[PDB]
Write a protein that binds this ligand. Structure first.
Ligand SMILES: *[C@@H]1O[C@H](CO)[C@@H](O[C@@H]2O[C@H](CO)[C@@H](O)[C@H](O)[C@H]2NC(C)=O)[C@H](O)[C@H]1NC(C)=O
Ligand SMILES: *[C@@H]1O[C@H](CO)[C@@H](O[C@@H]2O[C@H](CO)[C@@H](O)[C@H](O)[C@H]2NC(C)=O)[C@H](O)[C@H]1NC(C)=O
Ligand SMILES: *[C@@H]1O[C@H](CO)[C@@H](O[C@@H]2O[C@H](CO)[C@@H](O)[C@H](O)[C@H]2NC(C)=O)[C@H](O)[C@H]1NC(C)=O
Lengths: 110, 116, 186, 110, 110, 110, 186, 186, 110, 110, 116, 116
């Protein structure tokens, strides 16, 4: 009952990439929110997408997301040098007494 | 909103260590609080959560840590406590105390290194 | 075109409005009544896990309320205090002047957490949630309700022929309104 | 002409209602002195004579569909006026047009 | 058939009301151009001819009890419909049933 | 007896309304399963036969003044009852008094 | 069963609805009127200390409002700004669309502190508090009212026969609505 | 005294209520209808600068709302987001249950700043602002409306004879509702 | 016009005790709130019961209170070593220009 | 498009003075708020009258203001030694892209 | 919410002493403020109260202290002042400045010892 | 509410100077912010204004200063920046950063003296 993401993704500057987070019927497809986080090396993570698609004040509009079925995808368009980070997806499992589940994490390279 | 975590360091196998988190700039009483532990150079993990006093103040723990870790809170002191006991091997990590979404605002992190 | 039922001499026939058969006598607005009836009386399972499967969350549909003047004693009422796993309200607060159902022997008060995937909670079979003389399509927070339906009647001319303790049972729930839901009764 | 088709019938109707004109006793009608919100109800018990109760319940069932389609179409938040419209319709069917005596819809016997 | 039983009678009735259809003057009916909330009232003076005023006041007194018992029983917050129900009841008493000519309640003179 | 005095007439009326009693299909009447708020409307097209449309538009114009003076005088925030009052007035003019046959206002032909 | 009064030729008789005497003619809804009458006109003492003894606080009873179309000029209106000794509001704010009584020569504006032992303030004799074309069972904060009662009339067919400065006097009060109350008029 | 229009055999005559001509037949409340008609259909200029000159701010007049059951497809709707130069709201938020006009090909969404010298914005020619089955005398914030007027009809006995994409164009404005106003369309 | 309490009360650990605060018709029986306070030696008092029975956040549920007639009582069940303190009752007198009145105080011993 | 005030005003202690701020059709007479400010020598100005006549908490009631036509006037009654200050009027011009306009300023002497 | 009381000490008979209270963490302007004096080793007492400026800012005093004590407040400085004058014998006590209920939150206390 | 302005001093003709304002005690994000420059011993003037991010964050400038001055803001840092470039003669003044009315609460002021 752990959300799984790809080990790493890459892309040339200026293009668009999408990061996948797989779910389950009792995880994402049961109707629980998915949260995203960005961790720079040596620092605590910062909230990126609080709901499925929402953005907290201060986050550039390059970052968005969407939910399809039991999976969620983070879309980042316009790779800059500053986008290098670790991305994590989080959700609430319903078969684990409403306990938080954290994705495996994805490293970004440009 | 400032969260500062203190009072933690290395403990021997079977040891007990207590960690504390201080929260300021928001009403601590209403918010639900959770603890996350990140393995060094590895993916994030969820230690557990404590509900508000108004909702009964129940606490829930992760499957590995159940029965060994205790969560509590003090409204007047606006502090959150995590009691780690029977600390065996593979408990090393950075621990964080995070607020309820939205505006999770994770703290800075306390490194705990069990030494054998 | 809503079925209006007229009581004959100690019998009930659904008055057909398209034709005009004048032997029915309606001499005053006092003869018109609305009545709320409990689904329990039709034999539906009243167990909390069975009952909660009849409700579901949905977005995009505005709620609606209609009054009724007379009701039935309920055996089972329900009272929900459900929150999201982060800690938030998925049920709206009771509007001004919506109070709980007056008479029920048992009030099952359910607390816990769930996904609450929708703006409002509706009845999957299209029945109503009955409160004190107001029936609504949606569930309000912290307000005891009965499941029921509404009928309209022309009463007979004669008045005379026609027209307390409570207990609370507490439950904790996780995964409320999901395929597998965890209950503990205290 | 309604036949019950429910799994069961509770044949007894233990009902509650309000008395719009109670024979009040002195100062009990005065809001300051009167009963609290909880004490304004009266109760009673009706049995299933003449098979009436099983009829009544079934009628309620049959009403629901039509009632729902009504409330979907209205923009009012709380509806109090169904009985008034029913009475106005009743009056209009009978006296809304010219009454030709000996006609099937004019109910005057001379 | 009402006899005043009050300590006094102010025999004069200096009244105010609204004119639902005033013979408006040009653009005065347009909300943007019309009067403010305070200027929509008309006034007048009636005297106690025929002992009518002392009657009217007493009637108001007698109404209060019944009116209170009505509002206790309703769940509506603001009631606007009493006059409409009174008119519907008036129509129903007369034409709600079969009119037998020469009967004491059928008012047709042939 | 209404003659259009507007600068133009759009002679076609492409209208929308709600069907208070649709022949619902199975579970579509159930709020949980039914359409969203946006999908409850039906549409149609009427042409200017018999010069009716230019009449109708002009009628709307003429109504506005009287309607405004009505809403100025009421204290209700949302008015839902104009059609009900119109029907009650219609019934009262005809049956509110004694019907003398052969009179100009009693519409019974014997 | 609310007394409906019908005006005859310049006389008023309370129309008895149980019997049917057709000589009364009601040809349109325009003939129906509601009227508000002031208690002052019946000779009640209008002094502020005497008037305030007629009001009292009570919990558990929902407030109710009913409209009226025509009213009387008031000599005395009242306007209350009362707080608890710690400093809190014991009178609810005026709902949307409830304005003060339009015409009164004198507005007695009372400020001060009291125990305010109840959720709402009612009239001990069962009369109403009249505002601008709405009569309520309760007192609202900061809103001028008159004491009065409501009657319903069938007016005669003929229209014609049937149907500004203010001053404020200020008071300070302690122990408002108590056995011994302290007033100072400024 | 509001003009009620009765449809004859495929013709419309405004029914005169003072006289009584019985050949009109109204056998049920279903024959009564209200209809909203768009001002556009009468040839008024629809340009944004021309349209906005018809609205103006005013204090002291309470807003009012009246419903309508059937409407017309609109070509042009408007949606206003106007603020004071310091940064404040001069248009009130939409009350509960007031949604935008359902059908319009073009929605002109105007943003900017203005003096907003008045509590509410009214129509200078006395017409209404039409929303989803509610017509109001005032403009609400962030809610698409059409300009229109309301008529009342007695429909004929026969039912049958009687009774989607959108685009947004954005504007920025300064000096909104003033003698000289600055617009830029994006 | 001073509320009076008993000089001192005592009880064995684990039992329940009640502290009385006497009132008057114009003090407590006139309808004014009663507040309770706990003073540890050498420290400023802390609010215990803000209203007649309410408790501010942080106060253990061992402390409650009730009002009977013109007197108020503080009930403390389960004496612990930590309950040693001075307890004071306070209310608002109505014959003293709404001036606060403070009780004589009670010392607790275990 | 600059609001103009008099260079300086004077008056004996205890009397009343008024300070004028001239406007224009697109400045004050277009319906924009006028703000007033008080600057002591060597200090930043403080808000005096936030709207045309309003006063923020802490400002003595000696200061008021009124608007006539296209001009605004600040009235100060009861000159004290402490009233020596520079007064500035501010408003929003509508022909300057809603840009703030500041008055020339008035020095006060007693 | 922090209330600090300062500027008070012993005064001779007939002396005048002024005490001040500083309030932080809440809006001082709206709240009503009261002063309580506790005799050393004795029961609590009520010095007096000051109303809000919005309500007219009137002040009321206890019967013993009427005419000798003055209460005032400054909204901008968020400070509450008590002026004690004509201080005779038996005025010794700890003085406190307390907020309006709920959450009274009494300060720390200033000891005043008249010396003869 | 405390506004502190820093990082400014004299600049040569054609120079660029950057000024900053720090705001505390209120929510910086919602409020609109404006900059005013007062000539030494002379009347007040309006440099310009920046709108909220929610409203599109557009900025407007005075006619003399248009094209030479840039306004910006940082929500996370709660800071407001003014970039002065191509600073010619007659730009000397005290600059202030003021909040949206009501409660304008002007700061303390930064003196800028172009030197030739
Ligand atoms: C009216 O009565 C019928 C018959 O009891 C109810 O029917 C059921 O519909 C649900 C789904 O909508 C099915 O799961 C049941 O099996 C149906 N009943 C039977 C006996 O098969 C119907 O729900 C009632 N109406 C309302 C509004 O509750
Ligand atoms: C109707 O009139 C009667 C007579 O004036 C009012 O009667 C009084 O009731 C109160 C208590 O309810 C007594 O204190 C008075 O003494 C009664 N009057 C007399 C003359 O004895 C009655 O209050 C009026 N109705 C209303 C609703 O105000
Ligand atoms: C009804 O139609 C008339 C005629 O088109 C409208 O009349 C206008 O009134 C405004 C000012 O109120 C004038 O500027 C126009 O010039 C008038 N029209 C003409 C042709 O001169 C009237 O506004 C319409 N009614 C409503 C409510 O809109």
């Amino acid at each position: 009952s752990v959300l799984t993401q790809p080990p790493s993704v890459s892309g040339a500057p200026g293009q668009r990439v999408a990061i996948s987070c797989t779910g389950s019927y009792s995880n994402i497809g049961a109707g629980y929110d998915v949260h995203w986080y960005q961790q720079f090396p040596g620092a605590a993570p910062k909230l990126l997408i609080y709901a499925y698609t929402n953005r907290p004040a201060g986050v550039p509009d390059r970052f968005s997301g969407s939910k399809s079925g039991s999976s969620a995808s983070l879309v980042i368009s316009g790779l800059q040098a500053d986008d290098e980070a670790d991305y994590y997806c989080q959700s609430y499992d319903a078969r684990l007494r409403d306990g938080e589940v954290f994705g495996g994490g994805t490293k970004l390279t440009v | 909103v400032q969260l500062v975590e203190s009072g933690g360091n290395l403990a021997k196998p079977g040891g007990s260590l207590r960690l504390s988190c201080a929260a300021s700039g928001f009403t601590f009483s209403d918010a639900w609080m959770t603890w996350v532990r990140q393995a060094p150079g590895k993916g994030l993990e969820w230690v557990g959560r404590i509900k508000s006093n108004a909702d009964g103040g129940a606490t829930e723990y992760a499957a590995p840590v159940r029965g060994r870790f205790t969560i509590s809170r003090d409204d007047s002191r606006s502090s959150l406590f995590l009691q780690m006991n029977s600390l065996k091997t593979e408990d090393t990590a950075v621990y964080y105390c995070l607020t309820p979404p939205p505006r999770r605002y994770w703290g800075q992190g306390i490194l705990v290194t069990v030494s054998s | 075109s809503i079925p209006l039922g007229v009581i004959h001499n100690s019998a009930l026939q659904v008055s057909d409005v398209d034709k005009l058969v004048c032997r029915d006598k309606l001499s005053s607005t006092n003869q018109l009544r609305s009545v709320g009836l409990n689904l329990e009386g039709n034999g539906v399972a009243t167990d909390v896990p069975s009952a909660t499967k009849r409700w579901g969350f949905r977005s995009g549909v505005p709620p609606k309320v209609v009054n009724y003047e007379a009701g039935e004693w309920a055996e089972n009422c329900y009272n929900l205090e459900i929150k999201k796993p982060d800690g938030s309200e998925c049920l709206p607060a009771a509007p001004d002047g919506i109070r709980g159902f007056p008479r029920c022997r048992y009030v099952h008060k359910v607390s816990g957490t769930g996904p609450c995937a929708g703006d409002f909670a509706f009845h999957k079979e299209g029945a109503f949630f009955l409160y004190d003389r107001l029936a609504s399509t949606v569930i309000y927070r912290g307000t005891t309700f009965a499941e029921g339906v509404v009928a309209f009647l022309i009463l007979p001319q004669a008045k005379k022929d026609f027209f307390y303790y409570s207990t609370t049972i507490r439950y904790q729930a996780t995964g409320f309104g999901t395929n597998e839901t965890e209950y503990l009764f205290e | 002409a309604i036949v019950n088709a429910q799994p069961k019938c509770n044949p007894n109707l233990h009902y509650w209602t309000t008395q719009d004109e109670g024979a009040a006793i002195g100062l009990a009608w005065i809001p300051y002195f009167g009963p609290a919100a909880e004490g304004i109800y009266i109760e009673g018990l009706m049995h299933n004579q003449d098979g009436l109760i099983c009829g009544l319940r079934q009628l309620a069932n049959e009403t629901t569909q039509a009632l729902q389609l009504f409330l979907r179409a209205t923009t009012e938040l709380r509806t109090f006026s169904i009985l008034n419209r029913k009475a106005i319709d009743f009056l209009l069917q009978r006296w809304g047009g010219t009454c030709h005596i000996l006609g099937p819809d004019c109910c005057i016997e001379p």
